[PDB]
Amino acid sequence: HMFIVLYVNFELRRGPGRCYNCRPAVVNITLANFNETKGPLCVDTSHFTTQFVGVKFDRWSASINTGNCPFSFGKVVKFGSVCFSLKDIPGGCAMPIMANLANLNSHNIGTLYVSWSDG
Amino acid sequence: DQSKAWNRYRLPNTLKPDSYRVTLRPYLTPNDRGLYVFKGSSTVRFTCKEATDVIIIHSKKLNYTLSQGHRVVLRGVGGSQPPDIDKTELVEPTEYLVVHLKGSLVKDSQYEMDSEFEGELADDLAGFYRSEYMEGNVRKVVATTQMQAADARKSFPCFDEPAMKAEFNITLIHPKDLTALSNMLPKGPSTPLPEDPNWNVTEFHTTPKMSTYLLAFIVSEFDYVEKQASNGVLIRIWARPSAIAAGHGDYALNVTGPILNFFAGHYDTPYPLPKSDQIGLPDFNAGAMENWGLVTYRENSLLFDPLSSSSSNKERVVTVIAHELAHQWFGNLVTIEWWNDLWLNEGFASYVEYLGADYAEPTWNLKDLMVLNDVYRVMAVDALASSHPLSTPASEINTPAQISELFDAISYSKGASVLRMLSSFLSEDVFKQGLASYLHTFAYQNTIYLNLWDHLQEAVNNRSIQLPTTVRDIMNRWTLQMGFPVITVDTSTGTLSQEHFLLDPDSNVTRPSEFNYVWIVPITSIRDGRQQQDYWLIDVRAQNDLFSTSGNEWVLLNLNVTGYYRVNYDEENWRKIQTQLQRDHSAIPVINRAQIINDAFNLASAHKVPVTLALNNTLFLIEERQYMPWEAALSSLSYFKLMFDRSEVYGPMKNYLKKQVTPLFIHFRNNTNNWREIPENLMDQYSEVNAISTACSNGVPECEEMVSGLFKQWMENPNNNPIHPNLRSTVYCNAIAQGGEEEWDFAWEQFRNATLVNEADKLRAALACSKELWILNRYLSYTLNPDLIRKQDATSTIISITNNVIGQGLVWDFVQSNWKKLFNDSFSFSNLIQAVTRRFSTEYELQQLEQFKKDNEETGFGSGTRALEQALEKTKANIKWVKENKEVVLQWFTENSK
Ligand SMILES: *[C@@H]1O[C@H](CO)[C@@H](O[C@@H]2O[C@H](CO)[C@@H](O)[C@H](O)[C@H]2NC(C)=O)[C@H](O)[C@H]1NC(C)=O
Ligand SMILES: *[C@@H]1O[C@H](CO)[C@@H](O[C@@H]2O[C@H](CO)[C@@H](O)[C@H](O)[C@H]2NC(C)=O)[C@H](O)[C@H]1NC(C)=O
Ligand SMILES: *[C@@H]1O[C@H](CO)[C@@H](O)[C@H](O)[C@H]1NC(C)=O
Ligand SMILES: *[C@@H]1O[C@H](CO)[C@@H](O)[C@H](O)[C@H]1NC(C)=O
Ligand SMILES: *[C@@H]1O[C@H](CO)[C@@H](O)[C@H](O)[C@H]1NC(C)=O
Ligand SMILES: *[C@@H]1O[C@H](CO)[C@@H](O)[C@H](O)[C@H]1NC(C)=O
Ligand SMILES: *[C@@H]1O[C@H](CO)[C@@H](O)[C@H](O)[C@H]1NC(C)=O
Ligand SMILES: *[C@@H]1O[C@H](CO)[C@@H](O)[C@H](O)[C@H]1NC(C)=O
Ligand SMILES: *[C@@H]1O[C@H](CO)[C@@H](O)[C@H](O)[C@H]1NC(C)=O
Ligand SMILES: [Zn+2]
């Protein structure tokens, strides 16, 4: 068994005169056990569990959208082999990562890419 | 005295400024004398238009550092050689700094004047002043500005008249942890002050040619939200960090940009600046101020909480923003020549505000509310002999008190109403075309009223509009003479008659009129609910079959009250109107049902119809559900309350109102599921509030039980308010009046710990509804303690107390006792006089008012002078009105109350 953990954190610019609804000045998106120069983190499991660890303070919150993906992070379901990355996987899906200000702006701050085979 | 120029209130024509540079440094901690102060310097470059041996410039409450023995240094420009200074002096009454020269300045040459000065960052809400608020356990101090009309001189020396436009180079020295803001964007990033790194220096780009009264300097720890408008302009909503984080500036951001570009497109005139900052201050005298690029607001005119603010608060926010943004064109780009024409600024803003607000919230239909909130609001004062024309002669406006006095219902609401009518006989598209030319031609300049007629005539001609005469001759009748006409219709003949309407026939009109109080009136009409052709009344008396009737026919004049006049009818037409209101009032437009009510009550006061006719017009209200007709009746009858709520007549009147409103109250009780929902339509929301307020105020037991129940439920769960914000003003006030010390204390603590000014305002007003005289006396002492009630809310709270029948004698005694002490020290002496005297209806009260005038005559009443004269005129009319109507009214209420 193995967990697939996507960490999403962001911070607003410090005052004075901070723009509360602007795109967060600091953004830290980490996919656990992923190295950009080795490529997609693919599944080595008989079963795996996805965990989303998004920041939430006051009206600000992080979320991962479904994007152009037949599934959603969390609700994944049979697999041949599924791969995850924070860089483009040609032939896969793109799950947008957003920083959302409740009832105001939403900001795209990253992208999770998923790939899979049938089985 | 008057022989010397420095003892006269208007600046000489000898010097004209070209460009200023100003550096200001607020000290947000008190000094060893206990004062918050600001230090500044300034250089003004000016041109000598006419040779003179004196420099007269405005200066108010500024202490100057002497340089080479004098308060200023004078230098030459491009070869010019300035004479030596003989001496400088400060002339306090005219607020001048006077530099007496040993030689004469040379015509057409330029000069530069350096000064170094200090002033107080007082809590007086004028000039460069301070505002405070709590963040945690820390009291934050803000440096901010308010220059209109004549307080720019209080922050630095300047030629402080709106027609002395100039460019300004602002520099602000501020603590390093604070942001500095001004009209323009900063000219580079904020640098540390070399002398002291704990301070930074922010220099701002040069402003456009501008009036001094539109400058703004702010130093604060505020945050903001931003959004770029669809016309390129950057919008930012600034406020306390907690308010921004909570989202209380989000609604302002949603509407500000769109309204700005709507105005730009509507008048075919771009907004020439790259940004427009909206900032809400904790301490602020007026509602807002249109400083070019840095619009300042009362928190309750800009901030909005969706869960705790009411729909009426929401309307206020979008309306004031629209008002301030309209000023960017009518006021900032094109400015009045002198304050006597103030309506060119405030009349247009008070009219255009409805177009901008309607664009932002098209479902509300706010433009209809202009008849209640502007037209009939100002007709109350414009029907006095002591009113004044929209455009006063410039010779008559000189002192700061005279100037402040004209920020009144004439310059605002009447100006709006004549524009509403002007924009009605011509189309809004013809109107806006004429204004587009007016704005383009006079950009960065100053105008008088005749300049506007010319460009409206250009539009009339290009669009082939046929008027009875020139725009000039039509609109001068509504601009150069005070008041308005009453159009009396005789439907048996079809004859029309106009005359100056005066609330008291015996009032003495002393102001002469070059038109002998005759107007050119555009008259619309409906016949049995069907609009007829327009007609122009150009003489005192006319005849036309458009106003003749046969059989069951009835006619009404002034459709949707677009024109600024009142209408009276022959008895028979009135009767058919009343029959129509009883059979099916929907046949009469909603606005004209309000007209029928309001006109008759005012006509009755003027002894032009029987008071019983006006009261009979309120009988159909028991079946009326719309907001406007009910509000017209409640407002007209507030005069009856003022005259009778201390007499035996109040009982019968309350029973009548109880009868009339109870079905409506029960209707809303059903329509809302016992008050757990609010109507979807905005006007229906306001009619619900008035139904609850009227029912509770006149003794409907169900409403009294409801409001005290809701309030007690709240005290048992303080952190979960069960009262919808729309009902809070009414529920709070009635629960306070019905309760006692426990309810008053609970609301007082809620007011002290308030995080939202909208909520504090409602609590502040409801605390004045206490029935305990000792509580009202204690509350009165709070209003003058700045640590308990902000100075910006002092007079407003005192007015809430005087509106309480138990508070009337307390406040009047207080005003008589403390006027001399009061007068020195932000405080609307005019509004308070208006409020504390409107109940006067006896010779005894008139005696006190007369003695009040004599006892304080020499000290003066400042911007309350007209208010007092109008109080005397109204008090004398009230005496006659009560003697003539008391028994009639008492009997009418008793009979129609069963
Ligand atoms: C305010 O700032 C403006 C812009 O920096 C100054 O205008 C310049 O004035 C100098 C004369 O010293 C001219 O040579 C430049 O051509 C001007 N530039 C522009 C763009 O007009 C202005 O002099 C400053 N005023 C004061 C009182 O300091
Ligand atoms: C008089 O004012 C009323 C509004 O109080 C106008 O009524 C609206 O007219 C528009 C377009 O005809 C309709 O879409 C609205 O539903 C109407 N509102 C109401 C409340 O009826 C009316 O048109 C005005 N009369 C004139 C001649 O302009
Ligand atoms: C980014 O987030 C990861 C996961 O929460 C954390 O381990 C890491 O320290 C963070 N990096 C920075 C620079 O904050
Ligand atoms: C990531 O992979 C590259 C290529 O193998 C390697 O050079 C680099 O050191 C790795 N970084 C980490 C943090 O493992
Ligand atoms: C300016 O001088 C006057 C008179 O000397 C004094 O009363 C006032 O307090 C001074 N203002 C400041 C800010 O020190
Ligand atoms: C003040 O200056 C310092 C140093 O240049 C800078 O780091 C800081 O951001 C400045 N503060 C403001 C409010 O501009
Ligand atoms: C402002 O508009 C946004 C976008 O339509 C809306 O989601 C939001 O609720 C509005 N905010 C307020 C306070 O009106
Ligand atoms: C009227 O027409 C003339 C000539 O076409 C034009 O110069 C002027 O700007 C027009 N005025 C208005 C208000 O449209
Ligand atoms: C008031 O109503 C009565 C009927 O109750 C009517 O006789 C009278 O004419 C009305 N007053 C008028 C029309 O002034
Ligand atoms: Zn205004």
Numbering used by the authors:
A (entry chain C): 299 to 374, 378 to 420
B (entry chain A): 66 to 890, 895 to 967
Reproduce the article's own wording on this structure.
The coronavirus S-protein is responsible for both host receptor binding and fusion of the viral and host cell membranes. Its ectodomain is composed of the N-terminal S1 region that harbors the receptor binding domain (RBD) and the C-terminal S2 region that mediates membrane fusion. To address these questions and to gain further insight into how the 229E S-protein mediates membrane fusion, we determined the X-ray crystal structures of three additional RBD (Classes III, IV and V) complexes with hAPN, as well as the cryo-EM structure of the ectodomain of the S-protein trimer. We find that an invariant set of core interactions defines the interaction with hAPN across all the RBD classes characterized.
To gain insight into how loop variation is accommodated while maintaining receptor binding, we have now determined the structures of the Class III-V RBDs in complex with hAPN. RBD Classes III, IV, and V are from viruses that arose while circulating in the human population and they share important features that differentiate them from the tissue culture-adapted Class I virus. In Loop 2, they all have a deletion of two amino acids that allows Arg 357 of Loop 2, the last of the absolutely conserved residues, to form a stronger salt bridge with Asp 315 of hAPN than what was observed in the Class I complex. In Loop 3, all three classes have acquired two leucine residues not found in the Class I sequence: Trp 404 and Ser 407 of Class I are replaced by Leu 402 and Leu 405 in Classes III, IV and V. The sidechains of these leucine residues occupy the volume filled by the tryptophan sidechain in the Class I complex. The sequence changes in Loops 2 and 3 lead to a small re-orientation of the main body of the RBD in the Class III, IV and V complexes. This in turn leads to a compensatory twist in Loop 1 which preserves the core Loop 1-hAPN interaction. In Class V, the motif is GPG and by constraining the Loop 1 conformation, the proline residue (Pro 314) likely leads to a stabilization of the interactions with hAPN. In Classes IV and V, the conversion of Gln 311 to Arg 311 permits a weak salt bridge interaction with Glu 291 that is not possible in Classes I or III. The Class III, IV and V RBDs all bind hAPN with higher affinity than that of the tissue culture adapted Class I RBD (16-fold for Class V).
